[PDB]
Amino acid sequence: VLKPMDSEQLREYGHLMVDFIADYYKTIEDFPVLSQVQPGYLHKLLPDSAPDHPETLDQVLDDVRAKILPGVTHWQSPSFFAYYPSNSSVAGFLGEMLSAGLGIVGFSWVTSPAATELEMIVLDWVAKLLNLPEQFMSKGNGGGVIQGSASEAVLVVLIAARDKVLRSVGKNALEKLVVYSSDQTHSALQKACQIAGIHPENCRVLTTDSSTNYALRPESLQEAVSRDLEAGLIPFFLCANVGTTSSTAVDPLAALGKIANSNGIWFHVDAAYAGSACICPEYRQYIDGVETADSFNMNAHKWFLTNFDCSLLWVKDQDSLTLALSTNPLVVDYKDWQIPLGRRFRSLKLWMVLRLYGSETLKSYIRNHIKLAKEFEQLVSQDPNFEIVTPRIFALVCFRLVPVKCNNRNRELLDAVNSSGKLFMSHTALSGKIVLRCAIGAPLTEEKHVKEAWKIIQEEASYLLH
């Protein structure tokens, strides 16, 4: 009989669960990547009440196989090419295991000093791998913190910026604060603006087009800022993207940051996905200008082999955060850097990734995925029925069927491909027209899977065309 806690039961049952998960990974290719169940399928398979008496672990695992797994979209499949990767690694899995086993909640330094200091140290490590400027290192006025997601990271710095303005001019000025970003910016910014009370008409979504590969034009930011200043409004927050979700566009951080600095605009850089690549010198160029940023954000749980959740946020003045987020009327108390109070030992998995793989292995991994994406881009360019929509900079390839009413052949192709169960890809829209995406990021993906995916896409397009 299983007890609430017992070291030996934990050992036995944990070995069983380890074997189960390993078997899952060993046969992951046997599942349809995108789940094919119907909405509501699960409530008929499970009781509508918890059991009075315990049920076996074998029964739970059988229910996982037969009831839960059919309803899973396999993010770790070697043929998962959708959205952006959400990496799971052996090192990160071991880190999550250890974090759950320790079971500590580190609000404040005392409730596990190691949980705070290891986080400080590994954020420093990653900042050094990224060649971030000195203002983002813990030894200065700034520092780093692990957030639950890039959405929370942007909310935190937006609140910090808002409050820096409001406690100098008064809360009645909320109606005048303006946020700036390009029309490629992730929806997390709009949601943070809503939560923070920014007025909708003061969310400046600046237009971009193909002439700049959907990168924000600095001159349009300057014009918008000057028109807002003339109108008595207070520009206060700017979000630049390094690797947008749609087409992996990259904004010019230098000129945008010069504008933001000159006008007292908090400068946030969202490199949630592509930031990982910037540990490679041939891609570090793409965050040039970050020295002007007040904050910088990269998702280690995307393309850095660190199991969700692990969003990394650096700021150049931690006081802005803690003055906004503290509730109180020498050492870091991380509750004052985040929305939640409690937090788990999330730095362990990042530390274990860094140690067990090495910067060299992480670089080679980034490069291998980019090489696979370049092979896919080559395959696309050789087929006259397809076209590359925007230049490929990292491991994301945007493409589409060449134009030849009411029906959208690109969506039909994507639906048929995803329904095959052999792979999973997602779509976006650029300048109003649909765009198919192939984002290579799963650790299991090999060139064989990319080749088979291209063959499947070709066969499906040919069948639909006839």
Ligand X SMILES: N[C@@H](Cc1ccccc1)C(=O)O
| Residues of span 45-84 touching a second copy by CB under 8 A | 46, 48-55, 57, 59-60, 64, 67-76, 83
Q: Cβ closer to ligand X: 2 or 341?
A: 341
Of 91, 216, 290, 315, the residue at the interface with a second copy (CB under 8 A) is 91
Structural contact between residues 420 and 455, judged by C-beta atoms closer than 8 angstroms: no
Q: Is residue 428 part of the contact set for a second copy (CB under 8 A)?
A: no
Cβ atoms of 49 and 8 within 8 Å: the answer is no
Residue 104, interface with a second copy (CB under 8 A)? Answer: yes
429 binds, among a second copy, ligand X, none (CB under 5 to 8 A by kind): none
Among 103, 232, 281, 432, binds a second copy (CB under 8 A): 103
Considering only 117, 288, 317, 387, the residue that binds a second copy (CB under 8 A) is 117
- Binding partner of 21, given a second copy, ligand X, none, CB within 5-8 angstroms per partner class: a second copy
Task: Choose between 155 and 293: whose C-beta lies nearer to a second copy.
Answer: 155
| Radius of gyration for the alpha carbons in the chain, expressed in angstroms and rounded | 24
As a whole number of angstroms, the distance between CA 402 and CA 409 comes to 10
Q: Quick check: 424 and 81 in contact, CB under 8 A? A: yes
Exactly one of 105, 173, 203, 416 binds ligand X (CB under 6 A); that residue is 105
Contact between 419 and a second copy per CB under 8 A: no
Range 142-171, binding a second copy (CB under 8 A): 148-152, 155, 159, 163, 171
In the complex, the smallest distance separating the C-beta of residue 442 from ligand X, rounded to whole angstroms, is 12
State the residue for tokens 């390839």: 397
Letters for 292-321 (x = contact with ligand X by CB under 6 A, - = none) are ----------x-------------------
Answer whether 165's CB lies under 8 Å from 226's CB: no
Q: Is 199 annotated as a binding residue?
A: no
Using CB under 8 A, count the residues that bind a second copy: 140
Among residues 62, 65, 66, 100, which is the contact residue for a second copy, using CB under 8 A? 100
Of 45, 66, 341, 465, the one binding ligand X by CB under 6 A: 341
Q: Which residues contact 395 (CB under 8 A, 6 or more apart)?
A: 277, 303, 366, 369, 370, 372, 373, 439, 440, 441
Nearer to ligand X, 14 or 342 (CB): 342
Q: Is 133 annotated as a binding residue?
A: no
Q: Which stretch binds a second copy (CB under 8 A): 103-111, 258-266, 384-392, 394-402?
A: 103-111
Residue nearest to ligand X (CB): 83
Q: How distant is the alpha carbon of residue 189 from its chain centre?
A: 13
CA–CA dist 342, 258 (Å, integer): 37
Q: Would you give the binding string for ligand X spanning residues 47-86, x where CB under 6 A is met? A: ------------------------------------xx-x
Query: 54-62: long-range contacts at Cβ-Cβ below 8 A with a sequence spacing of 24 or more?
Result: 54/1, 54/2, 57/2, 57/13, 57/16, 61/16, 61/20
Map the footprint of a second copy across residues 389-408, applying CB under 8 A. none
- Closest CB 107 distance from ligand X, rounded Å: 5
Report what 245 binds from a second copy, ligand X, none; CB cut-off 5-8 Å by kind.
Answer: ligand X
Between CA 423 and CA 450 the distance in angstroms is 10
Cα distance from N-terminal residue to C-terminal residue, the chain: 61
Partner from a second copy, ligand X, none binding residue 79, C-beta < 5-8 Å depending on class: none
In the window 324-363, what residues touch a second copy (CB under 8 A)?
324-325, 327, 330-331, 339-342, 344, 348, 351-352, 354-361
Note the residue count of the chain. 466
Of the candidates 245, 306, 338, 418, which one interacts with ligand X according to CB under 6 A? 245
186 is in an annotated binding site: yes
Max Cα separation, the chain? 73
Task: Read off φ and ψ for residue 21, nearest 5 degrees.
Answer: -65, -40
Task: State which of positions 197-216 bind ligand X (CB under 6 A).
Answer: none
Classify strands 386-388 and 396-401 as parallel, antiparallel or unpaired.
antiparallel
* Sheet bearing 426-430, strands edge to edge: 386-388, 396-401, 433-439, 426-430
Show the 3-state SS of 207-260.
CCCHHHCCCCCHHHHHHHHHHHHHCCCEEEEEEEEECCCCCCCECCHHHHHHHH
- Judged by CB, which is closer to ligand X: 290, or 310? 310
* 224: contact with a second copy by CB under 8 A: no
Q: Which residue's structure tokens are 């710095």?
A: 157
Q: In terms of Cα–Cα distance, which of 245, 266, 278 is closest to 156?
A: 266
Cα separation values, 463 from 169, 278, 399, 412, 452, Å: 64, 40, 19, 11, 16
Residues lying near ligand X in the complex (CB under 6 A): 83-84, 86, 105, 107, 245, 302, 341-342
Q: Which residues are annotated as a binding site?
A: 85, 186, 301
